[PDB]
């Protein structure tokens, strides 16, 4: 934060994408009551498990969003989720690196 | 790529004369250089003994995003104030409180928490192999085309005239 | 901005005990290096059983595919190789190495005692046959 | 015509039992193999010292990311001086 | 966590992916298809007991 | 990545830097006055970079995993779902078995049909 | 018997695990470090010592690979280049965790 110049700004915007990476619209996802901590006090099952992958509940699976946007456990759907113009097969739901 | 002597000794022999296999370690021992450190911590605690980044509203991640654009506006306020009143020498010293949540910070936006989460994938990992079988049912399909070859026989009945 | 990645902590390794603690030999890496450097293995184990037991059915089905055995009126079912007939004359041989095979090799079985042991000119000549395929 | 219909039949039966058999050889590989927890915690705990079995942030294939602690520590460390 | 859990899970490595050439940022490819009536063919090829 | 292990700290300070370099770049040292392309680009680069970055942040942590996949939980999720795959493989195995020994016999009578036709030729 | 497990066991699972894998193998088996026999022979008496609870500080890794090449004659003769060695263990080593780097490229672009 003392000596900053191109190369280190270049440096900082790849290291910001690295770490924290026209509709754009973010499905804004809401806590879902069925958990299983302080959800329902519930073991997975299959009432869950559908809940999370069809309905909009990022309990397992995901949340869907509108025009599409199917987030499952395991989808790598080409949504536009991100803030930019790009809708490119992002990563899954999960994107367990 | 190397000699290691004591356990060329220990290695070559030919029938009894050498010493039991080499097993791994379940438990404490003392092989060589590394302390053989058993259940190394992971999951730290979050409010019991140090700050917690995240409230009560079971958003841990949300909390953590909306604290850390909290430090960045206190940080930004603190260089203005330093900036406007240079006359503070304990500032410094909250950067040591920071170490405490450092701790929280052990914990805080990369490579951390999606682990939990793959517990869960543990199951949908058998739901996979059940993906698998599904293509395995296919071979069940292929023994319906034996009935085809069956059809066959029949094709040897009307061959034959 | 420092000392929250390059004094933070890692994860559990899991790289290591996904790729090596399966076996120890490098499956989760690239198998050029050994390729070029150690030469295969010995293919002789029970697969090889069953790549003859293999063989030796293409050769049952490939008995029906190829013309009629009536060339001298004796044959046999070769597990891994043809064996042309029997009775001296048309003494069968050794030929081997879908995809019909053809025989590659051939061996005359019938005076001094030292008869010849040298079949070189036929043993061209009838891989010349073989590579002809007519 | 029998035997050809037969052969096709058994040829394409073969196939599918190949292919049965391949998965089923994957899905034992896969079950009957598997990593220790204990193992996984110990190799963290004493790898968290250097750089040796630690996932970086930019690691990719035939990055600086190497299988050796360090450089003086393995190369001129103990191997090289006391165990030559 | 832990890399590991005390459970026996399904997931079939795919090692067919041998390193053969310095692509960027890793992204190795699977090649080696293992084909079953494949590799026969080319065992009983060079490993068929050719001497007996 | 959707986890949280050490990027937090590193990207607010990385992000704090990044803004501080571009209101020095904007107001202190530039072509603003006397009393090009490429910082430009590199400007606007991050910040369109640090904008997207952020929103990719919070969609991911209200989107991360919540409270659930205790230890006793997924441990008996995965033995259920580790028995029930067992089963589905040896019902699998059990049918490909059927279909080779089939397969086999088929092989095997027309064997004895192409012996039988060569014997009587 | 009562030495083996505070001496093998102390030189077992540090020993066939993590330092000197192939990265610095090839100038090091050229030169001469277990070219011997009889070291060959402990070592492939010793073959399963590359446990994964102390894979961070050993003394030499891949064990069945150096008794390939001890065997094949791949150790001191050929394989001697460091180019393509260290290009291996690098490709060796950062393998298992290329899918997090190709997914954050993937999710970049």
């Known amino acids: 934060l003392s000596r900053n110049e191109i190369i280190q700004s270049y440096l900082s915007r790849q290291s910001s994408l690295l770490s924290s990476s026209a509709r754009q619209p973010h499905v804004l996802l809401p806590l879902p009551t069925p958990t299983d901590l302080p959800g329902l006090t519930r073991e997975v099952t299959q009432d869950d498990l559908d809940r999370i992958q069809a309905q909009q509940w990022p309990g397992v699976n995901g949340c869907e969003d509108t025009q599409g946007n199917w987030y499952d456990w395991t989808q790598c759907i080409s949504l536009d989720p991100h803030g930019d113009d790009g809708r490119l097969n992002i990563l899954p739901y999960v994107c367990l690196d | ?161 | 901005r420092d000392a929250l990645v390059h004094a933070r902590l890692p994860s559990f390794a899991i790289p290591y005990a996904i790729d090596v603690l399966t076996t120890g030999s490098y499956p989760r890496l690239p198998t050029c290096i050994r390729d070029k450097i150690i030469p295969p293995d010995p293919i002789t184990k029970i697969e090889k059983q069953a790549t003859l037991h293999q063989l030796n059915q293409i050769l049952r089905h490939r008995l029906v595919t190829t013309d009629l055995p009536p060339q001298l009126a004796n044959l046999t079912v070769a597990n891994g190789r043809v064996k042309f007939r029997v009775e001296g004359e048309f003494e069968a041989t050794l030929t081997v190495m879908e995809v019909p095979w053809r025989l590659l090799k051939l061996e005359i079985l019938v005076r001094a005692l030292v008869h010849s042991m040298q079949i070189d000119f036929i043993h061209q000549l009838v891989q010349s046959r073989l590579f002809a395929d007519e | 015509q029998l035997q050809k219909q037969l052969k096709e039949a058994e040829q394409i039966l073969a196939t599918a039992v190949y292919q049965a058999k391949e998965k089923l050889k994957s899905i034992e590989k896969a079950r009957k193999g598997a990593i220790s927890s204990e193992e996984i915690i110990k190799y963290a705990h004493r790898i968290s010292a250097s750089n040796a079995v630690c996932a970086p942030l930019t690691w990719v294939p035939g990055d600086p990311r190497r299988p050796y602690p360090t450089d003086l520590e393995m190369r001129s460390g103990l191997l090289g001086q006391m165990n030559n | 966590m832990s890399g590991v859990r005390a459970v026996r899970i399904s997931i079939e490595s795919a090692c067919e992916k041998q390193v053969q050439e310095v692509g960027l940022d890793g992204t190795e490819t699977y090649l080696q298809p293992l084909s079953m009536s494949q590799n026969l063919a080319r065992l009983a090829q060079r490993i068929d007991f050719s001497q007996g | 990545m959707a986890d949280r292990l050490t990027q937090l700290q590193d990207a607010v300070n990385s992000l704090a830097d990044q803004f501080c370099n571009a209101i020095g770049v904007l107001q202190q040292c530039g072509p603003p006055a006397s009393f090009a392309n490429p910082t430009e680009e590199y400007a606007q680069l991050f910040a369109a970079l640090i904008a997207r970055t952020a929103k990719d942040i919070d969609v991911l942590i209200d989107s991360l995993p919540s409270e659930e996949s205790t230890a006793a939980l997924q441990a008996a999720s995965l033995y259920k779902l580790e028995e029930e795959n067992h089963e589905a493989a040896t019902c699998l195995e059990d049918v490909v078995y059927r279909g080779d020994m089939l397969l086999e016999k088929i092989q095997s009578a027309l064997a004895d049909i192409a012996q039988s036709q060569l014997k009587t030729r | 018997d009562d030495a083996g497990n505070r001496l093998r066991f102390q030189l077992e699972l540090e020993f066939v695990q993590c330092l000197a894998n192939p990265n610095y193998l090839n100038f090091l088996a050229q030169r001469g470090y277990f070219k011997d026999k009889a070291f060959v022979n402990y070592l492939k008496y010793l073959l399963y010592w590359k446990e994964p609870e102390y894979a961070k500080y050993l003394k030499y890794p891949q064990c069945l690979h150096m008794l390939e090449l001890l065997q094949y004659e791949h150790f001191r003769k050929e394989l001697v280049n460091a180019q393509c060695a260290k290009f291996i263990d690098e490709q060796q080593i950062l393998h298992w965790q290329h899918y997090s780097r190709k997914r954050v490229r993937l999710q970049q672009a």
């Open chain 2, 1 to 161: 790529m190397q000699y290691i002597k004591e356990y060329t000794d220990e290695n070559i022999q030919e029938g009894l004369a050498p010493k039991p296999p080499p097993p791994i370690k379940d438990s404490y021992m003392m092989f060589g250089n590394q302390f053989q450190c058993d259940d190394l911590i992971i999951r730290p605690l979050e409010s019991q003994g140090i700050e917690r980044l995240h409230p009560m509203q079971f958003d841990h991640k949300k909390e953590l995003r909306k604290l850390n654009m909290s430090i960045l506006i206190n940080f930004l306020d603190l260089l203005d104030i330093l900036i406007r009143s240079p006359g503070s020498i304990k500032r410094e010293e909250k950067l040591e409180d920071l170490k405490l949540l450092f701790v929280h910070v052990h914990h805080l936006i990369n490579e951390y928490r999606p682990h939990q989460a793959r517990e869960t994938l543990r199951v949908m990992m058998e739901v996979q192999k059940r993906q698998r079988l599904e293509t395995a049912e296919r071979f069940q399909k292929h023994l319906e085309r034996v009935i085809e070859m069956i059809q066959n026989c029949l094709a040897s009945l009307p061959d034959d005239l």
